[PDB]
Amino acid sequence: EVETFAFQAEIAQLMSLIINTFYSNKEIFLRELISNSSDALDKIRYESLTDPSKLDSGKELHINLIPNKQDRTLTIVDTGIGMTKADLINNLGTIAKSGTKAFMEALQAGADISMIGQFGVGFYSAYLVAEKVTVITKHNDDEQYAWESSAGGSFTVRTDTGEPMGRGTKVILHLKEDQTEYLEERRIKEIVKKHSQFIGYPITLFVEK
Ligand SMILES: Cc1ccc(C(N)=O)cc1N
Protein backbone atom coordinates (compact mmCIF):
# COMPACT_ATOMS: atom_id res chain seq x y z
CA GLU A 1 0.00 0.00 0.00
CA VAL A 2 1.87 3.02 -1.37
CA GLU A 3 0.81 6.63 -0.80
CA THR A 4 1.88 9.27 -3.33
CA PHE A 5 2.22 12.92 -2.33
CA ALA A 6 2.93 16.16 -4.16
CA PHE A 7 5.88 18.22 -2.98
CA GLN A 8 5.01 21.70 -1.87
CA ALA A 9 5.65 23.99 -4.83
CA GLU A 10 8.60 25.67 -3.11
CA ILE A 11 10.30 22.31 -2.49
CA ALA A 12 9.69 21.18 -6.07
CA GLN A 13 11.33 24.43 -7.15
CA LEU A 14 14.37 23.83 -4.89
CA MET A 15 14.63 20.31 -6.24
CA SER A 16 14.61 21.37 -9.91
CA LEU A 17 17.15 24.11 -9.16
CA ILE A 18 19.48 21.53 -7.62
CA ILE A 19 19.00 19.21 -10.59
CA ASN A 20 19.27 21.74 -13.43
CA THR A 21 21.79 24.36 -12.26
CA PHE A 22 25.31 23.96 -13.62
CA TYR A 23 27.43 23.53 -10.50
CA SER A 24 30.56 21.39 -10.43
CA ASN A 25 31.15 21.16 -6.65
CA LYS A 26 28.74 18.25 -6.19
CA GLU A 27 30.75 16.45 -3.49
CA ILE A 28 29.19 18.60 -0.73
CA PHE A 29 26.13 16.33 -0.78
CA LEU A 30 27.98 13.90 1.47
CA ARG A 31 28.88 16.55 4.05
CA GLU A 32 25.23 17.61 4.18
CA LEU A 33 23.90 14.09 4.74
CA ILE A 34 26.55 13.26 7.34
CA SER A 35 25.68 16.49 9.16
CA ASN A 36 21.99 15.53 9.08
CA SER A 37 22.93 12.16 10.57
CA SER A 38 25.02 13.84 13.26
CA ASP A 39 22.07 16.11 14.13
CA ALA A 40 19.81 13.05 14.43
CA LEU A 41 22.31 11.26 16.67
CA ASP A 42 22.55 14.37 18.86
CA LYS A 43 18.77 14.29 19.35
CA ILE A 44 18.53 10.69 20.51
CA ARG A 45 21.58 11.14 22.74
CA TYR A 46 19.95 14.15 24.40
CA GLU A 47 16.70 12.24 24.97
CA SER A 48 18.67 9.35 26.49
CA LEU A 49 20.24 11.67 29.09
CA THR A 50 16.98 11.69 31.07
CA ASP A 51 15.42 8.45 29.76
CA PRO A 52 17.93 5.64 29.14
CA SER A 53 15.15 3.41 27.78
CA LYS A 54 15.25 5.56 24.64
CA LEU A 55 18.32 3.50 23.68
CA ASP A 56 16.57 0.13 24.10
CA SER A 57 16.29 0.18 20.29
CA GLY A 58 20.08 0.36 20.01
CA LYS A 59 22.84 1.80 22.18
CA GLU A 60 25.42 2.37 19.42
CA LEU A 61 25.50 5.90 17.99
CA HIS A 62 27.29 5.84 14.64
CA ILE A 63 27.30 6.61 10.92
CA ASN A 64 28.03 4.03 8.21
CA LEU A 65 28.82 4.75 4.56
CA ILE A 66 28.03 1.76 2.34
CA PRO A 67 28.88 1.88 -1.38
CA ASN A 68 27.51 -0.82 -3.66
CA LYS A 69 28.86 -0.73 -7.22
CA GLN A 70 26.54 -3.53 -8.38
CA ASP A 71 23.41 -1.61 -7.36
CA ARG A 72 25.08 1.77 -8.06
CA THR A 73 24.00 3.02 -4.64
CA LEU A 74 25.68 4.93 -1.84
CA THR A 75 23.89 4.44 1.47
CA ILE A 76 24.35 6.68 4.53
CA VAL A 77 23.18 4.83 7.67
CA ASP A 78 22.83 6.37 11.11
CA THR A 79 21.39 5.18 14.42
CA GLY A 80 19.95 8.58 15.28
CA ILE A 81 16.45 9.48 16.43
CA GLY A 82 14.84 8.55 13.10
CA MET A 83 11.63 10.10 11.88
CA THR A 84 7.94 9.31 12.18
CA LYS A 85 5.61 8.98 9.21
CA ALA A 86 4.40 12.51 9.96
CA ASP A 87 8.01 13.71 9.94
CA LEU A 88 8.68 12.06 6.57
CA ILE A 89 5.66 13.69 4.92
CA ASN A 90 6.55 17.03 6.54
CA ASN A 91 9.68 17.38 4.38
CA LEU A 92 11.72 14.83 6.34
CA GLY A 93 11.46 16.75 9.59
CA THR A 94 12.62 20.10 8.21
CA ILE A 95 11.13 23.55 7.81
CA ALA A 96 11.88 23.28 4.12
CA LYS A 97 9.36 25.88 2.92
CA SER A 98 10.92 28.76 4.87
CA GLY A 99 14.41 27.31 4.39
CA THR A 100 13.98 27.22 0.62
CA LYS A 101 12.70 30.82 0.66
CA ALA A 102 15.81 31.97 2.51
CA PHE A 103 18.16 29.84 0.39
CA MET A 104 16.98 31.15 -2.97
CA GLU A 105 17.11 34.76 -1.82
CA ALA A 106 20.70 34.14 -0.74
CA LEU A 107 21.49 32.53 -4.11
CA GLN A 108 20.39 35.59 -6.08
CA ALA A 109 22.37 37.62 -3.50
CA GLY A 110 25.70 35.94 -4.29
CA ALA A 111 25.49 32.63 -2.42
CA ASP A 112 26.20 29.27 -4.05
CA ILE A 113 24.68 25.82 -3.72
CA SER A 114 27.34 24.64 -1.26
CA MET A 115 25.74 26.90 1.39
CA ILE A 116 22.47 24.91 1.29
CA GLY A 117 23.00 23.42 4.76
CA GLN A 118 22.96 26.86 6.35
CA PHE A 119 19.27 27.00 5.37
CA GLY A 120 18.18 23.65 6.81
CA VAL A 121 17.48 21.91 3.49
CA GLY A 122 20.84 20.22 2.92
CA PHE A 123 19.10 16.85 2.42
CA TYR A 124 17.96 17.88 -1.06
CA SER A 125 21.59 18.25 -2.16
CA ALA A 126 21.34 14.47 -2.55
CA TYR A 127 19.86 15.21 -5.98
CA LEU A 128 23.21 16.66 -7.07
CA VAL A 129 24.38 13.06 -7.53
CA ALA A 130 21.27 10.85 -7.20
CA GLU A 131 18.52 10.27 -9.74
CA LYS A 132 16.42 8.64 -6.99
CA VAL A 133 16.65 8.77 -3.20
CA THR A 134 15.13 6.20 -0.84
CA VAL A 135 14.89 6.98 2.88
CA ILE A 136 14.25 4.11 5.31
CA THR A 137 13.62 5.25 8.85
CA LYS A 138 12.55 3.98 12.27
CA HIS A 139 11.63 6.27 15.17
CA ASN A 140 10.99 4.91 18.67
CA ASP A 141 7.41 6.24 18.48
CA ASP A 142 6.42 4.84 15.05
CA GLU A 143 6.80 1.94 12.61
CA GLN A 144 9.49 1.53 9.96
CA TYR A 145 8.72 3.53 6.81
CA ALA A 146 10.23 4.04 3.36
CA TRP A 147 10.16 7.45 1.64
CA GLU A 148 11.15 7.66 -2.02
CA SER A 149 11.40 10.28 -4.75
CA SER A 150 12.87 10.62 -8.23
CA ALA A 151 11.98 14.36 -8.08
CA GLY A 152 9.42 15.25 -10.77
CA GLY A 153 7.16 16.76 -8.12
CA SER A 154 6.09 13.73 -6.09
CA PHE A 155 7.28 11.37 -3.37
CA THR A 156 5.93 8.11 -2.00
CA VAL A 157 5.63 6.78 1.54
CA ARG A 158 4.98 3.15 2.45
CA THR A 159 5.39 0.88 5.43
CA ASP A 160 8.76 -0.82 5.00
CA THR A 161 8.71 -4.61 5.04
CA GLY A 162 12.48 -4.70 4.47
CA GLU A 163 15.24 -5.45 6.96
CA PRO A 164 14.29 -4.16 10.45
CA MET A 165 16.44 -1.20 11.49
CA GLY A 166 15.93 -0.91 15.24
CA ARG A 167 16.25 2.89 15.18
CA GLY A 168 17.69 5.47 12.84
CA THR A 169 17.70 6.49 9.21
CA LYS A 170 19.09 5.03 5.99
CA VAL A 171 19.54 7.37 3.00
CA ILE A 172 19.98 5.33 -0.19
CA LEU A 173 21.39 7.34 -3.11
CA HIS A 174 20.64 5.77 -6.50
CA LEU A 175 23.50 7.51 -8.27
CA LYS A 176 23.37 9.12 -11.69
CA GLU A 177 25.35 7.20 -14.31
CA ASP A 178 28.12 9.82 -14.48
CA GLN A 179 28.44 10.19 -10.69
CA THR A 180 29.90 6.77 -9.84
CA GLU A 181 33.10 8.34 -8.46
CA TYR A 182 31.25 8.55 -5.14
CA LEU A 183 31.34 4.75 -4.93
CA GLU A 184 35.16 4.63 -4.94
CA GLU A 185 36.82 4.20 -1.55
CA ARG A 186 39.54 6.80 -2.07
CA ARG A 187 37.05 9.44 -3.26
CA ILE A 188 34.71 8.91 -0.30
CA LYS A 189 37.66 8.96 2.12
CA GLU A 190 38.88 12.24 0.63
CA ILE A 191 35.47 13.88 0.99
CA VAL A 192 34.99 12.71 4.57
CA LYS A 193 38.43 14.02 5.56
CA LYS A 194 37.87 17.34 3.76
CA HIS A 195 34.38 18.19 5.00
CA SER A 196 33.46 15.95 7.96
CA GLN A 197 36.63 15.70 10.04
CA PHE A 198 34.99 17.06 13.24
CA ILE A 199 31.82 14.94 13.30
CA GLY A 200 31.48 13.55 16.82
CA TYR A 201 30.40 10.04 15.86
CA PRO A 202 32.35 7.18 14.28
CA ILE A 203 32.04 7.20 10.49
CA THR A 204 32.76 3.76 9.04
CA LEU A 205 33.40 3.49 5.30
CA PHE A 206 32.49 -0.06 4.29
CA VAL A 207 34.55 -1.80 1.60
CA GLU A 208 33.30 -4.07 -1.18
CA LYS A 209 34.09 -7.29 -3.08
C1 LIG B 1 16.18 15.96 6.28
C2 LIG B 1 16.70 14.87 7.15
C3 LIG B 1 16.92 15.08 8.51
C4 LIG B 1 17.39 14.07 9.33
C5 LIG B 1 17.67 12.81 8.80
C6 LIG B 1 18.17 11.72 9.68
N1 LIG B 1 19.38 11.23 9.45
O1 LIG B 1 17.45 11.31 10.60
C7 LIG B 1 17.45 12.57 7.45
C8 LIG B 1 16.98 13.59 6.63
N2 LIG B 1 16.76 13.33 5.29
UniProtKB/Swiss-Prot annotation:
Region (Interaction with NR3C1): 1-209
Compartment(s) where it occurs, according to its Swiss-Prot or TrEMBL record: Nucleus; Cytoplasm; Melanosome; Cell membrane
Top-level taxon: Eukaryota
Entry-annotated residues carrying N6-acetyllysine: 43, 69
Residues that hold ATP according to the record: 36, 78, 97, 123
Record's comment on post-translational modification: ISGylated. S-nitrosylated; negatively regulates the ATPase activity and the activation of eNOS by HSP90AA1.
Domain notes: The TPR repeat-binding motif mediates interaction with TPR repeat-containing proteins like the co-chaperone STUB1.
Subunit description: Homodimer. Identified in NR3C1/GCR steroid receptor-chaperone complexes formed at least by NR3C1, HSP90AA1 and a variety of proteins containing TPR repeats such as FKBP4, FKBP5, PPID, PPP5C or STIP1. Forms a complex containing HSP90AA1, TSC1 and TSC2; TSC1 is required to recruit TCS2 to the complex. The closed form interacts (via the middle domain and TPR repeat-binding motif) with co-chaperone TSC1 (via C-terminus). Interacts with TOM34. Interacts with TERT; the interaction, together with PTGES3, is required for correct assembly and stabilization of the TERT holoenzyme complex. (Microbial infection) Interacts with herpes simplex virus 1 protein US11; this interaction inhibits TBK1-induced interferon production.
Function: Molecular chaperone that promotes the maturation, structural maintenance and proper regulation of specific target proteins involved for instance in cell cycle control and signal transduction. Undergoes a functional cycle that is linked to its ATPase activity which is essential for its chaperone activity. This cycle probably induces conformational changes in the client proteins, thereby causing their activation. Interacts dynamically with various co-chaperones that modulate its substrate recognition, ATPase cycle and chaperone function. (Microbial infection) Seems to interfere with N.meningitidis NadA-mediated invasion of human cells. Decreasing HSP90 levels increases adhesion and entry of E.coli expressing NadA into human Chang cells; increasing its levels leads to decreased adhesion and invasion.
Family, similarity comment: Belongs to the heat shock protein 90 family.
Protein name: Heat shock protein HSP 90-alpha
Organism: Homo sapiens (Human)
Gene: HSP90AA1
